[PDB]
Amino acid sequence: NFNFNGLTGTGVLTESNKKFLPFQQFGRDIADTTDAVRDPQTLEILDITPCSFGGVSVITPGTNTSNQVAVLYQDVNCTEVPVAIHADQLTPTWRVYSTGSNVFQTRAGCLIGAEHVNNSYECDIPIGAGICASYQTSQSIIAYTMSLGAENSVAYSNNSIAIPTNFTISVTTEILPVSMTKTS
Amino acid sequence: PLSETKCTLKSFTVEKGIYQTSNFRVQPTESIVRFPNITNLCPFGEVFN
Amino acid sequence: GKIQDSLSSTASALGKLQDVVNQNAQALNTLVKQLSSNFGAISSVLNDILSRLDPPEAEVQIDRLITGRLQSLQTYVTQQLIRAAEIRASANLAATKMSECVLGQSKRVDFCGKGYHLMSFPQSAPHGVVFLHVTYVPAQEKNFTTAPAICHDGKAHFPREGVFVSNGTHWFVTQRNFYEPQIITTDNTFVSGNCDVVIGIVNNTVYDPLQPELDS
Amino acid sequence: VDCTMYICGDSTECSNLLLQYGSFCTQLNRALTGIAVEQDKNTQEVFAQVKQIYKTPPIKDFGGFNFSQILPDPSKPSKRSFIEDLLFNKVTLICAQKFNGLTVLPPLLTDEMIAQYTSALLAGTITSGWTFGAGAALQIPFAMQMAYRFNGIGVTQNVLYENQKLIANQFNSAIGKIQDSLSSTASALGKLQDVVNQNAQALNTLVKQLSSNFGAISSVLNDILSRLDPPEAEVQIDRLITGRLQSLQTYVTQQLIRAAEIRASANLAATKMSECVLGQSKRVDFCGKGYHLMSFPQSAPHGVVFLHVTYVPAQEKNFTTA
Ligand SMILES: *[C@@H]1O[C@H](CO)[C@@H](O[C@@H]2O[C@H](CO)[C@@H](O[C@@H]3O[C@H](CO)[C@@H](O)[C@H](O)[C@@H]3O)[C@H](O)[C@H]2NC(C)=O)[C@H](O)[C@H]1NC(C)=O
Ligand SMILES: *[C@@H]1O[C@H](CO)[C@@H](O[C@@H]2O[C@H](CO)[C@@H](O[C@@H]3O[C@H](CO)[C@@H](O)[C@H](O)[C@@H]3O)[C@H](O)[C@H]2NC(C)=O)[C@H](O)[C@H]1NC(C)=O
Ligand SMILES: *[C@@H]1O[C@H](CO)[C@@H](O[C@@H]2O[C@H](CO)[C@@H](O)[C@H](O)[C@H]2NC(C)=O)[C@H](O)[C@H]1NC(C)=O
Ligand SMILES: *[C@@H]1O[C@H](CO)[C@@H](O[C@@H]2O[C@H](CO)[C@@H](O)[C@H](O)[C@H]2NC(C)=O)[C@H](O)[C@H]1NC(C)=O
Ligand SMILES: *[C@@H]1O[C@H](CO)[C@@H](O)[C@H](O)[C@H]1NC(C)=O
């Protein structure tokens, strides 16, 4: 919590390369929010940013199938995750999910409890940034990059065609809402 | 976290998927107050004593 | 039978319609919960304010409670209006699907289900409709050699309706969506100019159906 | 939007005061999550219409037709076509707004995956035509595909084979002309740029609304907490909370309306892809102006571009008829 000549705020101070004018004291962005500050005791400029901030998401398969779950912290490098939740919860359970061997970093954020693998499968539980987690393997939660599909190189040529021999009469169910309860 | 998900869903069973349970923020580690350095021997102290 | 079994076994098949219902239900529940909110007032029960507090301050307390409840109700009504617009769009889509699929055959791709649409069977459901889109779909495909046209009598020939396919030795004309090879004849082909302008044209004989009759 | 943080900002007293208002923040968060899921579903529906990731042949022997401008370029780091690269470059604040409780960036599908989906759709349309859009993909020469489309629009296939070279040259010239028009004209992508600008303006207005006192002594909770004692700081914070909550409700309602509009646009785009891209559409002026033949999908930041190809009469001669 920083106070600079009444400029009360909270954030992480860091060295700034901005060249403030001699008379200039505070910095601002297009949003009209402080982004830099000058130390009143020395001609130094320091940036201001939110501490870590972020939502927490639980990725879990069907409870009747398994109990272990993965924890995703949004847009935060894993190094800050142990301090992100203060690690002051009950000694088992949450403490395990705050740090461990299976820790992965992605544009979405930091994932814990999911073992990253090179193999790509269909997106089971979407996470983001083209990354999804699946419970399939002992069975454990894994995270991977969802595969858009199976590669199929069509044998194209300028003098060859493909004609069906038999067919299939498929039936597909399409469900569409038509109305809602007439609440008054 | 499973119990937090159950709370947010208000149910004892949770289906496969990802659920946003809550938010988190790194609390202020310490409080820092900085004001301009103090001028040398202002007349205020001269007046007293 | 397979779709019936899938619907019976799969609980999430109707997840769409149920979700809608659930959404509405949830909203209703939320509205009721909004009646148990102080909104800065001393209490959330009008009787408590009326009894404990005298009219001079009970007036402002009830005004605050009324403002909070009215804001909650307006938010709920706006959400309901947005959801009703979404439901109207869905119902218009469903009516269009009923008209173009059940009452007729639609040439739109992936509109009346996946595949070459044939017909659809409407079914009712709580606040929703289900379409059993029936679609012809190719199952097994065989690859052959094809040419854009045929030059039999020094003139290019093009299929009247179909494509010229050919296995190892012989040449045949078959419909695009089914492998039904037929003998190439002038009946199912038409000529257009010479055969030195088309690229990829091949030599072949177009049997004349009149030749057996001409001989007699 | 972190409703509690945006309204209060690590103010315990403000959080306690807002707790008396019910769960408005809960509904706002639910609506925003639903909007995000809606956007993800729209993107999936528009771009996940191909069962398999079809790949073009190593040699582009398409009877003179050129698809380099629309096909992926291996040389570039990102496997994006020239037109796709131009669209991405032309479209260009948000990253400098994630300070007051905004998390925007993470999409379900990255630009690379959307580019791969578009490439697969293009490969299926070129090598297989519309066959891959209704079952197993059946290979066919592109010249024969154009012949089939000409027959479909009511023109005998013989014209294409008689003027295959001319038609291919015209198609290449049209592709080059549209590429040049997109490069030179900055208003070609007006819709996507306008949507992005509207979203950025809405977010900026929401952020700036925190500086409005809404009838309070000050717009910063610390000043009210310090200068004013709790008996009056409570009412001041309540007034500020009411103002901020009203602003957030208005912003969320506008976001919901815009999300509904975007869902309608995405449904239209998916219909066009199903009909214009995965098949031949008989609808007039639906897949471009003129007798539609085929379409080429291209990805752009938060949008799609269809290069609708249309046969159009050019020279008309008058004759007597009975
Ligand atoms: C083209 O594809 C269709 C689609 O399946 C084929 O029809 C099916 O062909 C199989 C193989 O001959 C049939 O299985 C047979 O069933 C009988 C009676 O149960 C059984 O005694 C045989 O031992 C064999 O298992 C199947 O009944 C038949 N129909 C269906 C609905 O699957 C068709 O044969 C393929 N070929 C052609 C030229 O159409
Ligand atoms: C399809 O059939 C036609 C004839 O029915 C083929 O055209 C003929 O091709 C032969 C092969 O060369 C020609 O013979 C010789 O060609 C040389 C070079 O052009 C020329 O200098 C000779 O005087 C001699 O003509 C023949 O002239 C030509 N035309 C005929 C027979 O009327 C055609 O080649 C066949 N298509 C394909 C793809 O082979
Ligand atoms: C404000 O006053 C302080 C008083 O200490 C100054 O501190 C100086 O710091 C530098 C190092 O950067 C030392 O070399 C000097 O010896 C310090 N001065 C004294 C008197 O000890 C500080 O520089 C001043 N800042 C401004 C902007 O005037
Ligand atoms: C389709 O592609 C094949 C393979 O390249 C082409 O075959 C060539 O045809 C020309 C035409 O005179 C010959 O000069 C070449 O020697 C052929 N090359 C080979 C490797 O066979 C064919 O012309 C193309 N066009 C079609 C099939 O219509
Ligand atoms: C912080 O996050 C960035 C990217 O999110 C990463 O490159 C960097 O290494 C992280 N630093 C720490 C100390 O976690």
Q: What is the DSSP code string of A72-117?
A: EEET--GGGHHHHSTT-S-TTTHHHHTS-S-EEE-SSEEEES-EE-
Asked if C140 has any chain A CB less than 8 Å from its own CB, the reply is yes
Q: Which helix (DSSP H) or strand (DSSP E) does residue D80 occupy? A: none
Q: Write D1-5 long-range contacts (CB < 8 A, 24+).
A: D1/D28, D1/D29, D1/D32, D1/D101, D1/D102, D1/D206, D1/D248, D1/D251, D1/D252, D2/A53, D2/A55, D2/B23, D2/D101, D2/D102, D3/D28, D3/D29, D3/D101, D3/D248, D4/B23, D5/A53, D5/B23, D5/B25, D5/D100, D5/D101
Does the beta-carbon distance from A60 to B14 stay under 8 Å? yes
Amino acid of residue C210: L
Chains with at least 3 CB pairs less than 8 angstroms from chain D: A, B, C
Q: Extract the tokens encoding D273.
A: 């892809």
Residue pair C16/A182 in contact (Cβ under 8 Å)? The answer is no
Phi/psi zone of residue C190: left (φ > 0), alpha (ψ -120 to 50 degrees), beta? beta
- Cβ(C139) – ligand 1 distance below 6 Å: yes
Report the distance separating Cα D205 and Cα D97, nearest Å.
Answer: 11
Report the distance separating Cα A105 and Cα C10, nearest Å.
Answer: 35
Report the distance separating Cα C146 and Cα A158, nearest Å.
Answer: 9
Of A165, A169, A175, the CB nearest to C14: A175
Q: Which helix (DSSP H) or strand (DSSP E) does residue B18 occupy? A: strand B17-24
Residues, chain B = 49
Cα–chain-centroid distance for residue D87?
12
- All residues of chain C having their beta carbon less than 8 Å from the beta carbon of residue A155 are 143
Q: Does residue A48 sit in helix, strand or coil?
A: strand
Residue pair A111/A56 in contact (Cβ under 8 Å)? The answer is no
- All residues of chain A having their beta carbon less than 8 Å from the beta carbon of residue B37 are 40-41
Closest ligand relative to C138 C-alpha: 1
- All residues of chain B having their beta carbon less than 8 Å from the beta carbon of residue D2 are 23
Q: Are strands A7-9 and A2-4 parallel, antiparallel or unpaired?
A: antiparallel
- In chain A, residues preceding a discontinuity (C to N beyond 2.5 A) are 137
Report the distance separating Cα C152 and Cα A2, nearest Å.
Answer: 92
Q: Extract the tokens encoding D184.
A: 């030179």
Give the experimental resolution in Å: 2.7
**Phi, psi (degrees; rounded to nearest 5) at D34:** -65, -40
What approach was used to elucidate this structure?
Answer: cryo-EM
If we measure between CA atoms, which residue out of A33, C24, A69 comes closest to residue D101? Answer: A33
Amino acid of residue D206: L
Report the distance separating Cα D81 and Cα D73, nearest Å.
Answer: 5
Return the residue matching tokens 């009877």. Answer: D63
Does the beta-carbon distance from C148 to D136 stay under 8 Å? no
Report the distance separating Cα C96 and Cα C92, nearest Å.
Answer: 6
Give the residue whose CA is nearest to atom 12 of ligand 3: A42
Handedness of CA C150, C152, C156, C159 (dihedral sign): negative
Q: Which of C144, C199, C202 to mutate to test the pocket of ligand 4 (most atoms within 8 A of CB)?
A: C199
- Beta strands of chain D (E only): which ranges? 53-55, 291-294, 297-300, 303-306, 309-311
**Phi, psi (degrees; rounded to nearest 5) at A35:** -125, -15
Cβ neighbour number for residue C196 with a 10 Å cutoff: 10
If we measure between CA atoms, which residue out of A13, A12, A87, A90 comes closest to residue A53? Answer: A12
Closest ligand relative to A159 C-alpha: 4
Q: At what angle do helices D190-208 and D230-272 cross, to 10 degrees?
A: 170
Pocket of ligand 2 (CB under 6 A): C 151, 154, 202-203
Report the distance separating Cα D295 and Cα D272, nearest Å.
Answer: 9
Task: Give the list of residues 6+ apart from residue D196 with CB closer than 8 angstroms, or none.
Answer: D91, D301, D302
Residue pair D101/B23 in contact (Cβ under 8 Å)? The answer is no
Of A53, A129, A150, the CB nearest to D110: A129
CA angle D35, D38, D41 (to 5 degrees): 155
Phi/psi zone of residue A36: left (φ > 0), alpha (ψ -120 to 50 degrees), beta? beta
**Phi, psi (degrees; rounded to nearest 5) at C93:** -60, -40
- All residues of chain D having their beta carbon less than 8 Å from the beta carbon of residue B25 are 5, 10
Return the residue matching tokens 């998900």. Answer: B5
Does the beta-carbon distance from A8 to D220 stay under 8 Å? yes
Q: Does residue C92 sit in helix, strand or coil?
A: helix
